Amino acid sequence: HHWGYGKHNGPEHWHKDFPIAKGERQSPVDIDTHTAKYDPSLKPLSVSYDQATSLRILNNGHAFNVEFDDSQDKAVLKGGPLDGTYRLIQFHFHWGSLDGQGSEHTVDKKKYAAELHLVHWNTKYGDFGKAVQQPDGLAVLGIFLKVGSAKPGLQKVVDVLDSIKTKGKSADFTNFDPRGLLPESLDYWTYPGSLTTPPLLECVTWIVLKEPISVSSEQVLKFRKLNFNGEGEPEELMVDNWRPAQPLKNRQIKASFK
Numbered sequence: 225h226h227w228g229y230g231k232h233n234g235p236e237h238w239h240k241d242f243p244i245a246k247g248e249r250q251s252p253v254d255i256d257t258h259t260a261k262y263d264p265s266l267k268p269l270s271v272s273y274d275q276a277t278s279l280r281i282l283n284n285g286h287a288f289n290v291e292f293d294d295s296q297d298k299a300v301l302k303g304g305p306l307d308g309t310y311r312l313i314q315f316h317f318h319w320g321s322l323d324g325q326g327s328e329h330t331v332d333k334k335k336y337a338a339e340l341h342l343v344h345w346n347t348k349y350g351d352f353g354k355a356v357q358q359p360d361g362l363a364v365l366g367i368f369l370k371v372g373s374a375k376p377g378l379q380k381v382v383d384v385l386d387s388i389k390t391k392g393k394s395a396d397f398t399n400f401d402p403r404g405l406l407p408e409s410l411d412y413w414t415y416p417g418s419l420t421t422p423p424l425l426e427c428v429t430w431i432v433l434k435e436p437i438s439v440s441s442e443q444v445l446k447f448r449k450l451n452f453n454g455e456g457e458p459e460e461l462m463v464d465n466w467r468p469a470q471p472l473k474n475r476q477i478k479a480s481f482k
């Protein structure tokens with residue numbers, strides 16, 4: 225498979241190899257703030273990243289992934305809509321060619337410059353590969369980025385990108401603290417959905433924070449110097465690696481806040 229984000233292998237083509245592309249619980253979606261309803265039964269959200277152990281940063285030809293040690297309950301997400309414990313495995317971003325696009329989820333059809341996904345798996349399923357086969361296998365915490373002030377907690381990430389320019393490059397990336405990527409508020413929207421890349425599995429509880437983080441133009445500019453290609457191939461800038469909004473179908477988006 226050679227799926228990607230170009231004219232010839234982009235999101236409108238994915239259904240031919242991945243028919244679940246046209247499924248009943250596909251992501252991302254537009255979040256209509258006037259239709260999402262406050263749900264007073266959501267328990268509080270618990271982001272417990274004090275013991276997070278980052279290992280490595282990888283350019284996989286689709287995004288860059290910061291990977292963590294998930295062999296024990298070191299960094300976990302619990303509470304909110306979630307039953308049980310979800311272990312942080314990695315984070316990555318989706319971004320645009322221009323500051324006015326880049327996010328996957330939209331808010332009243334607004335696109336942000338980028339979107340951060342912190343990916344966690346349900347520890348009751350024992351490993352990540354088993355989890356992705358379950359309707360409640362993953363929890364992805366989504367955080368919008370807007371361009372304004374620099375985010376200091378992002379800069380260690382920006383600064384290593386030069387070293388993983390092309391597909392298949394990785395670098396050691398220890399002692400990175402993902403708490404530095406969080407906004408002040410944990411107010412969120414939640415809905416059931418899917419992975420936003422092939423294989424597009426419908427295994428995700430989405431938790432999308434309402435408060436964006438600000439990053440500087442210089443910071444997002446550096447994302448856009450990455451490459452989708454491997455070393456020694458013609459240069460294709462890693463930009464616009466986002467899937468557009470998919471039909472909501474028979475789903476409700478719940479708000480944690482009034």
Ligand SMILES: Clc1ccc(OCc2nnn[nH]2)cc1
Pocket residue numbers: 289314316341343364418419420421
């Ligand atoms: Cl481990 C993993 C890495 C990337 C990835 O990108 C597609 C996606 N992003 N958010 N949900 N699905 C999904 C899972």
Ligand SMILES: [Zn+2]
Pocket residue numbers: 316317318341420
């Ligand atoms: Zn993602």
